[PDB]
Design a protein around this nucleic acid. Structure first.
Ligand SMILES: [Mg+2]
Ligand SMILES: [Mg+2]
Ligand SMILES: [Mg+2]
Ligand SMILES: [Mg+2]
Ligand SMILES: [Mg+2]
Ligand SMILES: [Mg+2]
Ligand SMILES: [Mg+2]
Ligand SMILES: [Mg+2]
Ligand SMILES: [Mg+2]
Ligand SMILES: [Mg+2]
Ligand SMILES: [Mg+2]
Ligand SMILES: [Mg+2]
Ligand SMILES: [Mg+2]
Ligand SMILES: [Mg+2]
Ligand SMILES: [Zn+2]
Ligand SMILES: [Zn+2]
Lengths: 386, 87, 131, 61, 150, 136
RNA sequence: UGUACAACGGGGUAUUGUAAGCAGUAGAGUAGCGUUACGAUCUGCUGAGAUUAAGCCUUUGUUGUCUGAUUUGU
RNA sequence: GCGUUGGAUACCCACUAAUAGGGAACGGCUGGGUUUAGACCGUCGUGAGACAGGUUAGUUUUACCCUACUGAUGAAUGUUACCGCAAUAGUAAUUGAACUUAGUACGAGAGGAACAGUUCAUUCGGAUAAUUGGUUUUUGCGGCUGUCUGAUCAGGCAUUGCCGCGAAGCUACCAUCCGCUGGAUUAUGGCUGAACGCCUCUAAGUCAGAAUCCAUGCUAGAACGCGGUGAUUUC
RNA sequence: GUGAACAGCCUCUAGUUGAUAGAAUAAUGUAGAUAAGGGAAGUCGGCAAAAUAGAUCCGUAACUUCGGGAUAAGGAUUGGC
């Protein structure tokens, strides 16, 4: 008989199975559509989630109740040192889909990216790409032939880049290597751009800019084995119910004589790949700016780094991206920032952000001071200072 | 309420999208391309300054290793009868 | 956090503040108004026998007398002696509106203080006479 | 005999997921191996060329 | 946008920090921390809690009346915007802060003078009162010197 | 947002579910208001309708004038004890939950409001702002 | 055999609330001969003292460590 | 496609866009019921007792098995490592209000829209911990009772002794952020045009058009689907 | 010793230190706690928890077999020196 009271199901069936992701770096499943008239550009970038802080925004939004008013909003900081271009991959179209035709690498690869190819770097002889580097000798035959093959046959061009993780405060020395699609001119122009940019760095402000909506692709924070109540949001059973109350009381009461795939079951929570969209860049901060944490309204000379550093991450000494809201993943996880797949038609994409103040108080407690100088000036002279 | 897949709303969105939003996107793309070219030029200048102190047919096989491996693989598939396209 | 502090100082169980009680005690007219209240059925003792310092109603005159002969009332009287700690005190402690705070303290010392003390003495002798 | 046994990384050497460390069994087998080595030495065999050519476990009462 | 001072301990209250309580007489009590908020709810005396600026000013731990402390007050009468006046104010704020820090340092040093004399008197009394430990120390030093020599 | 409200309303933390009792802040003679319904509330299984600052509810008078009692009337919440976030950058709360008696058009029955009135409620309802003597 | 790693230590960043000891003329009074004795507490040295990664940040210091086992070929 | 409620005792009250009907039983917890032994009242019976009936109290306690389902490892096709493709399977957003259009069209009046352009919210979903709140074995800091270590200091026990604060972590419509756009169609409105020398949206052909369908986008990745690339052993 | 007390808690004499152990801290349990705002809206049913509690003082209704009800109810206080 019919259920007496209607209610929506618990959870989303399109995010199944709730298994652990195959990698700590989430895959980009779709790149923005290529317009052959535009100049050559990267479709994405790689960074490390450092933490979150608070800003005050002077909002200009016509028609809104908070027009010409100040709003306090949460932001996320991603440390983004420049990436290093080290390779190019060509893709051809087949009746079975896209197929990688060829890959061409640069002459010199740093140890930071060489470590990605090793499980035991300290015992290895570090022989990676040693014979490959010899193919650049005597006019680069072979390398030129494969580049010509990519020019002649490939319909999609991607560039292999890696992060400079040695510039981050991370204890990991092994860099992350990824493919980024080149959207721009012709295939030959993409190949020429990649060849000219071999062993060269690309900064984050040559890929993105302020007031732009981007997408964050990352693996969420893991939580291990979890019950149905917190895995799916099901209602708890009454107190002292036999055989537990953090369960679904009846997993089946009808003919099929099986447990349906759409019934909530206990299992892994978190560590899933997620692609969240439409996060607005509030600031593209440069690493060489002594006051990248200051605004035109707040004249205090300070950086983006909070007092005591970001908790569990450290200081920010490179270029960074400040986007509003939150993104999937925890601190110090590698994240991919992707260009929007469509031209956004909301006015928020056309809004221009003007920050009035950026919070730099300590996140290791109830921080009340923005700078150590402010803390010293408020407290006064201590016993050890005299 | 009209759904996200409503035809009239999507048509109005496309009419809006062909204008000011696309103009802003194109301007941002031009500025980003200019900054990318400047970044490359600055890297070239720094590399030149650093070095100042210090101072096609695609036919056939890719290489001999590729030829040997592909011939061995095709012979193995012919021997084991595990080929997708050839009997 | 703990159950005792939560169930004593919950927001819905809040009591009257010291600065408000000081302002009530400062003027003789307010003391007379709080001594002569209309008969309210929602208050203990028909709104009579009201201790202004503790801001507390009593059911009986003997209850009020025993409350006056107690350390809790003495603690409240001891608390109500000095400056009532408005926002100006904290502002001047931080280094803000220092002249305003000093002028307020001087006015409290000169005019508000002795008049409030005399009103308290008159209230004490009135309670002693009527009790 | 490995139903409902825990999993370990030390089984990857033998290409399995379930391995244990049976101390009593290992001690008994060590005693028998030592006795076999003593018997071979008494016979005069070369100790460096010996291999376990047969080993069998049966159920006692 | 404005920095507020905590009602309980006078610490700065930046936007998005602490909590505010509104009383029936429209009085706003802003607290930088849950600690100060809970102390206020428990009705403790900030002039009795030693970790507050109210206690420090009342007890004389830090200077309270100074010419540098009169430059900041709430302006209920606004003034028309002037670029040169704004620049002058920005320079003057830094100069006043430096002078106030120097004066606070001098105040603390004047408060803490005499500690060296007290410590010397205590050390002299301890040395005069403990002869046996000094003899043990002399024996230890002499034996260490003999060990170093040989 | 209800008939008579001035524009849209952003979300405030809900403090008064159905069955709550709040004070009456006007001078119509009612002492307290017992919430039985919340106007504009959504629908979800097992979930109680709840009201925040600036919401219109249906209430019955429990204490006050007997003529006002034994009737259901619209009310507007002007104070709540549950802390809520303001976009200027602070969480805040009042001492008590308090409402005023009104009509479906949002017009006050009384002539004045005693105690403070929330900024959000005063901005959303012109008649509340007109009858308020203290607005935060 | 090194922007090497580790154990301590240093500096920051946070939590609490003013350490032990000494002293006073502050201390309701009481006892003996203005003084002395007892005396909850108060004041000063003292935002002092204590804790701070175990899933915080950083390190021109001290002391050590860098090594065994198994297997894999077109 | 998407929703279809909160309460009072089959009917009412209210909210709401709406509070549509039904099936997988009626061919896991749980109250009324098959409730056996105790007890009382009523009716009948000579009685043992039965009932036209009414009230109260009353032990049944798996899972470690197989499959299904949810998550997690894993041998083998030279070894090992990195970057990828996408068959197939799943799929997700929803409703209301507001500004402007406008006191305009329409209307004696009383009243009174919509498209285009904008702003918020309901239900759902996926995340996240900058802030606020909750939590405390950080037994981190301080305090209190009783007793014990001669006293101070420093501590033990009181089955986490108790009280206040409390970072870190976890977490909340109690907190914050984010959730789209191309083809083909249905009903229907048509164009050309016979059948049938009128006519006709239909027969051949053809234009549009629904929250529909298939895709774009999102999740997993065939452990017997695949590609590109690096290195490949001195006893 | 505290305390009205052969209660609870701590100690002296005497007597034990026995009950398979080690390493981690997922879900679900068994046993024990805390929780913003609201306060029974939950449920057949306030089941379970919470709240109360010692002692001193003020004061205590209907009804009644005049013996009770009664610690009715409702209020104030408690340390140290
Ligand atoms: Mg923190
Ligand atoms: Mg088991
Ligand atoms: Mg329900
Ligand atoms: Mg029976
Ligand atoms: Mg599909
Ligand atoms: Mg429209
Ligand atoms: Mg959640
Ligand atoms: Mg003790
Ligand atoms: Mg025709
Ligand atoms: Mg596979
Ligand atoms: Mg609660
Ligand atoms: Mg009920
Ligand atoms: Mg119900
Ligand atoms: Mg009775
Ligand atoms: Zn009193
Ligand atoms: Zn404070």
């Amino acid at each position: 008989s019919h259920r007496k009271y209607e209610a929506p199901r618990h959870g989303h069936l399109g995010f199944l199975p709730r298994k652990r992701a195959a990698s700590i770096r989430a895959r980009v499943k779709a790149f923005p559509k290529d317009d052959r008239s535009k100049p050559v550009a990267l479709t994405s970038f790689l960074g490390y989630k450092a933490g979150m802080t608070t800003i005050v925004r002077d909002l200009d939004r016509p028609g809104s109740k908070f027009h010409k008013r100040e709003v306090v909003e949460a932001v996320t900081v991603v440390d983004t040192p420049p990436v290093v271009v080290v390779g190019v991959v060509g893709y051809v179209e087949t009746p079975r889909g896209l197929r990688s035709l060829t890959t061409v690498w640069a002459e010199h690869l740093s140890d930071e990216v060489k470590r990605r190819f090793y499980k035991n770097w300290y015992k290895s002889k570090k022989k990676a790409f040693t014979k490959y580097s010899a193919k650049y000798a005597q006019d680069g035959a072979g390398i030129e032939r494969e580049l010509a093959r990519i020019k002649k046959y490939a319909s999609v061009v991607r560039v292999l880049v890696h992060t400079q993780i040695r510039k981050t405060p991370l204890a990991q020395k092994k860099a992350h290597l990824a493919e980024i699609q080149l959207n721009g001119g012709s295939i030959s122009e993409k190949v020429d751009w990649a060849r000219e940019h071999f062993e060269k760095t690309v900064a984050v402000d040559s890929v993105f800019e302020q007031n732009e909506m981007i997408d964050a692709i990352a693996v969420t924070k893991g939580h291990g084995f979890e019950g149905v109540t917190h895995r799916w949001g099901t209602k708890k059973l009454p107190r002292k119910t036999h055989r537990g109350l953090r369960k679904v009381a009846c997993i089946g009461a009808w003919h099929p004589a099986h447990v349906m795939w759409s019934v909530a079951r206990a299992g892994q929570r978190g560590y899933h790949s997620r692609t969240s969209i439409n996060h607005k860049i509030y600031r593209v901060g440069k690493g060489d700016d002594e006051a990248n944490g200051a605004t035109s309204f707040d004249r205090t000379k300070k950086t983006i780094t909070p007092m005591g550093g970001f908790v569990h991450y450290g200081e920010i000494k490179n270029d960074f991206i400040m986007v509003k809201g939150c993104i999937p993943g925890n601190r110090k996880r590698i994240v991919t920032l992707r260009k929007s797949l469509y031209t956004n038609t909301s006015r928020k994409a056309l809004e221009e952000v003007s920050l009035k103040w950026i919070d730099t108080a300590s996140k290791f407690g109830k921080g009340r001071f923005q700078t150590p100088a402010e803390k010293h000036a408020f407290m006064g002279t201590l016993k050890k200072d005299l | 309420a009209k759904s996200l897949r409503a035809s009239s709303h999507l048509n109005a969105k496309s009419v809006k999208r062909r204008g000011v939003f696309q103009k802003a996107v194109d301007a941002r793309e031009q500025r980003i391309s200019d900054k990318l070219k400047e970044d490359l030029l600055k890297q070239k200048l720094e590399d030149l300054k650093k070095k100042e102190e210090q101072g096609i047919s695609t036919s056939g096989w890719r290489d001999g290793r590729h030829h040997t491996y592909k011939k061995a693989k095709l012979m193995k598939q012919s021997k084991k009868k595990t080929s997708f396209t050839r009997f | 956090m703990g159950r005792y502090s939560v169930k004593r100082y919950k927001t819905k169980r809040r009591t009257r503040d010291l600065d408000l009680i000081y302002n009530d005690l400062s003027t003789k007219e307010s003391v007379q108004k709080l001594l002569n209240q209309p008969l309210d059925e929602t208050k203990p003792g028909l709104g009579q026998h009201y201790c202004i310092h503790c801001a507390k109603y009593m059911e009986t005159a003997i209850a009020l007398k025993t409350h006056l002969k107690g350390k809790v009332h003495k603690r409240r009287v001891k608390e109500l002696r000095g400056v009532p700690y408005t926002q100006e005190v904290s502002d001047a402690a931080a280094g803000y509106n220092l002249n305003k705070f000093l002028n307020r303290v001087q006015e409290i010392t000169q005019s508000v203080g002795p008049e409030k003390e005399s009103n308290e003495a008159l209230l004490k002798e009135h309670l002693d006479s009527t009790l | 005999f490995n139903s409902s046994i825990g999993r370990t990384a030390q089984g990857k050497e033998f290409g399995v997921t379930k391995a244990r460390w049976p101390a009593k069994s290992v001690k008994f087998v060590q005693g028998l191996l030592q006795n076999a080595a003593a018997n071979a030495e008494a016979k005069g065999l070369d100790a460096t060329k010996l291999y376990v050519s047969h080993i069998q476990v049966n159920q006692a009462p | 946008m404005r920095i507020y001072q905590c009602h309980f301990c006078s610490s700065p209250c930046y936007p998005g920090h602490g909590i505010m309580f509104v009383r029936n007489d429209a009085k706003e009590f802003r607290f930088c921390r849950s600690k100060c908020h809970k102390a206020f709810k428990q009705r403790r005396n900030p002039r009795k809690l030693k970790w507050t600026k109210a206690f420090r000013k009342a007890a004389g731990k830090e200077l309270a009346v100074d010419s540098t402390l009169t430059f900041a007050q709430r302006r209920n009468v606004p003034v028309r915007y002037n670029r040169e006046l704004v620049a002058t104010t920005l320079k003057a704020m830094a100069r006043i802060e430096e002078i106030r820090q120097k004066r606070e340092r001098a105040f603390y040093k004047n408060r803490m003078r005499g500690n060296k004399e007290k410590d010397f008197l205590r050390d002299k009394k301890l040395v005069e009162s403990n002869p046996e430990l000094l003899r043990i120390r002399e024996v230890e030093i002499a034996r260490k010197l003999a060990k170093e020599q040989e | 947002s209800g008939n008579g409200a001035q524009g849209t309303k952003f979300r405030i933390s809900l403090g008064l579910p159905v069955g709550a009792i709040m004070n009456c802040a006007d001078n119509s003679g009612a002492r307290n208001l017992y919430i039985i319904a919340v106007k504009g509330s959504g629908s979800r299984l097992n979930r109680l309708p709840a009201a925040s600052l600036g919401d219109m509810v249906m209430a019955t008078v429990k204490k006050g004038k007997p003529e006002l009692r034994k009737k259901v009337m619209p009310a507007i919440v002007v104070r709540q004890a549950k802390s809520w976030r303001r976009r200027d950058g602070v969480f805040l709360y009042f001492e008590d939950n308090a409402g005023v008696i009104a009509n479906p058009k949002g017009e006050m029955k009384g002539s004045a409001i005693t105690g403070p009135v929330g900024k959000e409620c005063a901005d959303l309802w012109p008649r509340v702002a007109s009858n308020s003597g203290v607005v935060v």
